[PDB]
């Protein structure tokens, strides 16, 4: 293979010479230690390599060897309940081989070669096979991991192994062509795994948060973006989605963020319970971690590794939720590499191809028909960190044109400790109309009417605050004061949610429906009582306001009695006030 020597070292970038015949985006070994690198520019006899590890201590003249293959991940059993770095190395074995610090040049297999799995075949000799078809089944933490033919492999079965226990290296199916299929295979991270047909979004993604589940829904195959300044609530929202959503498999990508949050996930999750399985919550989670003090060039690789793993779990018939902790650090890394290449920058110094990468990353999401005929889906939620809270950032504007949902956060709401601090005035969802047939079947026949009625009250309150800031709240009429008070009730009681409370952290759909029904019934009764001459300040002294104001903290199995008690108290209040 191609072998050369180092010519120039400067930070994360190494230029090697004598590399004629090397191909673009192949993986190289740099130096005597063997640091992993990637070719990004060919110029005559030389090549430009970005190194995925720290380059301090290197000297000019050390050998460079090209493997001739692009970056690839190993896909197979044994990936759940594990934590990986940016280029898929298990951290809990680096912890064994090294101290408490991460060093250079550690070579670990991604999948354990010593664990033995219970193999059960499905194909028999003489069968025709094709990419995407199932070969066998292996149990894993209550799942049934299905061994798949690689997407580009075709042939006829010659012999299979019987039922028994084998490692992932043992060949189970041998074809007439001579190829041997193992329990795992490798796939390049920059190539999207092929599908058969894309489907329509018609099933909601339940997050457990009232505002996101009701006002700004997202479908099972949709994409959403959550931008905001620092200390607004992105990380807590994404971890709540990891804890409480109804997805089968959750993939978490910590691109360029703190290590303490990864430690928090690693510690807290094994004590929790899966909402649909009953086992530990960590048995369905894959963590890809690349903290801020880890090397810069590995930030780009972690996103592709995570999305490739999420696509692999889609092909088995699962629904996967993918959370990207910060996609702004990816853009910052691309800007940092571009300074060494001496290219002409675009606006804000980013390389001109930034918008193509983001568009190609969000395009992988959706509900598909797999090559094996099953039905799976991948949904992506990506956080954006604009500099200084400037929403006109190029990354924010590029993300805004391709996502189907947009959950904007506000710093002013976060200052006063009003969470989740979603800015209602600048947020939207494009999946609201397509999910209406599902809500009528599963929640209630009148649910869209209630949601629209709540939206009308919020819009009317928003249109009246321009007068309160001008002449004070006490200059308005009685009905306007009632509208303001009901808007305050909605804002304080329905939208607000404490993620650290024992009961309020998770809210089902029917509980939110009941709360909306209670609020609308109170609003209509108060509006009727206004016409009878009753003053507005008399109405807000009623004890039924406490019942609505504390319906959040009622347990899930105690809510049906509380709702029917409150609906009777509503009649008991206004029929005796005047």
């Amino acid at each position: 293979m191609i072998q050369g020597v180092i010519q120039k070292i400067a930070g994360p970038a190494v230029i090697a010479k004598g590399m004629l015949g090397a191909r673009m985006y192949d993986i190289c070994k740099v130096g005597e230690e063997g640091l992993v690198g990637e070719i990004i520019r060919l110029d005559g006899d030389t090549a430009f390599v970005q190194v995925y590890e720290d380059t301090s201590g290197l000297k000019v003249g050390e050998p460079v060897v090209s493997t001739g293959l692009p970056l690839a991940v190993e896909l197979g059993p044994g990936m759940l309940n594990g934590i990986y770095d940016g280029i898929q190395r298990p951290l809990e074995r680096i912890r064994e081989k090294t101290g408490i610090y991460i060093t250079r040049g550690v070579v670990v297999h991604a999948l354990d070669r010593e664990k033995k799995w219970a193999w059960t075949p499905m194909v028999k000799p003489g069968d025709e096979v094709r990419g995407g078809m199932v070969l066998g089944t292996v149990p894993e933490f209550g799942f049934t991991h299905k061994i798949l033919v690689p997407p580009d492999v075709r042939g006829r079965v010659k012999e299979v192994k019987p039922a028994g226990e084998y490692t992932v290296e043992e060949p189970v199916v041998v074809l007439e062509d001579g190829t041997e299929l193992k329990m795992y295979h490798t796939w390049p991270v920059r190539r999207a795994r092929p599908v058969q047909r894309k489907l329509d979004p018609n099933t909601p993604f339940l997050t457990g948060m009232r505002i996101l589940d009701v006002l700004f829904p997202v479908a099972m195959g949709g994409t959403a973006a959550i931008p905001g300044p620092f200390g607004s609530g992105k990380t807590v929202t994404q971890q709540s989605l990891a804890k409480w959503s109804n997805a089968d498999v959750v993939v978490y990508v910590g691109c360029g963020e703190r290590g303490n949050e990864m430690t928090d996930v690693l510690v807290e999750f094994p004590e929790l319970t899966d909402p649909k399985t009953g086992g530990p919550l960590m048995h369905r989670t894959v963590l890809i971690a690349n903290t801020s003090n880890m090397p810069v060039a590995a930030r780009e690789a972690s996103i592709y590794v995570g999305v490739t793993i999420a696509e692999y779990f889609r092909d088995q018939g699962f629904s996967v939720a993918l959370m990207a902790d910060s996609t702004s650090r990816w853009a910052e890394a691309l800007r940092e590499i571009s300074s060494r290449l001496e290219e002409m920058p675009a606006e804000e110094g980013y390389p001109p191809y930034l918008a193509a990468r983001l568009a190609a990353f969000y395009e992988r999401a959706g509900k598909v028909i797999t090559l094996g005929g099953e039905e799976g889906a991948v949904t992506i939620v990506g956080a954006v960190s604009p500099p200084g809270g400037d929403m006109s950032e190029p990354v924010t504007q590029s993300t805004l044109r391709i996502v189907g949902a947009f959950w904007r956060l506000d710093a002013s709401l976060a200052f006063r400790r009003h969470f989740p601090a979603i800015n209602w005035n600048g947020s939207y969802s494009l999946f609201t109309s397509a999910l209406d047939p599902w809500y009528r079947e599963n929640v209630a026949e009148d649910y869209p009417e209630l949601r629209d009625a709540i939206s009308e009250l919020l819009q009317r309150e928003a249109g009246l605050q321009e007068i309160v800031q001008l002449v004070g709240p006490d200059a308005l009429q009685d009905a306007e004061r009632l509208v303001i008070e009901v808007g305050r009730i909605i804002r304080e009681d329905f939208l607000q949610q404490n993620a650290y409370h024992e009961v309020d952290a998770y809210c089902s759909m029917k509980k939110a429906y009941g709360i909306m029904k209670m609020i609308l019934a109170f609003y209509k009764e108060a509006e009727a009582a206004i016409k009878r001459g009753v003053s507005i300040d008399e109405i807000l002294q009623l004890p039924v306001l406490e019942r609505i104001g504390r319906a959040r903290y009622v347990s899930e199995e105690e809510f049906p009695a509380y709702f029917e008690e409150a609906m009777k108290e509503i009649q008991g209040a206004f029929k005796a006030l005047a």
């Binding site: 201590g57 000019v60 912890r95 991460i102 303490n260 003090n293 110094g349 200052f415 006063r416």
Partner: protein, 471 residues
Amino acid sequence: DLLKKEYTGITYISGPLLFVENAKDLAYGAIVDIKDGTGRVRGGQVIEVSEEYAVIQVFEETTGLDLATTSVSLVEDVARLGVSKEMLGRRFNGIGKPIDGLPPITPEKRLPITGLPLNPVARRKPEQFIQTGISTIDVMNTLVRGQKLPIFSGSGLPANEIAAQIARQATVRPDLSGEGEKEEPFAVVFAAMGITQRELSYFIQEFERTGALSRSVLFLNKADDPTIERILTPRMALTVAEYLAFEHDYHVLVILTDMTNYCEALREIGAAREEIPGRRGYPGYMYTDLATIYERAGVVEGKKGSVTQIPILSMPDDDRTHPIPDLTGYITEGQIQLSRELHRKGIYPPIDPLPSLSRLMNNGVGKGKTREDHKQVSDQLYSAYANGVDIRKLVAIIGEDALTENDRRYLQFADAFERFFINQGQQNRSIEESLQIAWALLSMLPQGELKRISKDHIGKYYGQKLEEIWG
């Protein structure tokens, strides 16, 4: 080895950069010695090497150098610091040389100053509550052992006095936490970058009066010292702190005097090399460079010691959206922000609670740690104060006499809050006293307005009077 290799043939000197041609044997990131024609030796570091030529940045000033008599010799391939337990009680300059007149340290180890990343598996959750004696911090922005909690300050505001008071009054509370284990006092590692004589003389006297110099290591880079030395100082300080914490089970408190000077020193070198800038001319890799400094704190599983950081930085023109505060807040676990408006009124310490934040508060408070009503009281105070501030804003438009009684209650609450809870002077308060004052303040409001507090806690604690404590 004993051998040393000389390099003549310098071809370009300008500003902080020096160029040497036939030097392909210098490793990237190595430390060099630059010898003048008069025999004076200055330091340097290789920042780009090639088989054609090499680029060296110079720490000291370039006065007196020339292209005919200057020579460059290699010191070591990787920048290292000799660390020892003997460093406690010593003073060093920005590059680790003694300035107290004592003989140098006999090393036990030689550790790289760039450091290595901590493995996320090897960490653990910081949960030990630290009592600083300031009500605005202990109750609403609680600090735990192993946290990074910078202080956001202005030009004329007293951040140094607050830092000294925190270092003087900080202690854990074993009786509340149920551990029962007493502690030795904190070891303080102090790193100054571009500090003036007026502040340094205050810090030295404050450390002398409390007897903390016997447990302290000081790294001093003054304002009349060379600028490029500021790149090394936080790395030296954090290397010593990490060695002491994770090798000898010390509890280390780290104070960095001004990160604004560090960012200016970084911008000078970045503009010399013509990097692609970010906002306001700062280099595009400033987020990564700052990340390697802050992320060296925390707690390690299976080890007793810990590192706690209190960086101090000044916001230019009191702007929170300047690149330095923005990139600092995107990394750290919170911040403490001072208010000039509170400082004008004589309130000390002038901590503004609304923009302040502590991310690790939920780990170290609650039942069995401080008290069962900590978090709900903290939330209710925030909501009531925000309502009071909004009513203050509305009064300036519509006038005070048009207010109802409900708005006047919140106005008086905000006034009493500022005059009694934030303003405490130099006195030391336990957590119980702070919670008692907070409950006394909340008793002014109607009982039905305490939405965020559970009814059992309200029945247990409501009904205090503030005037009995002082009158």
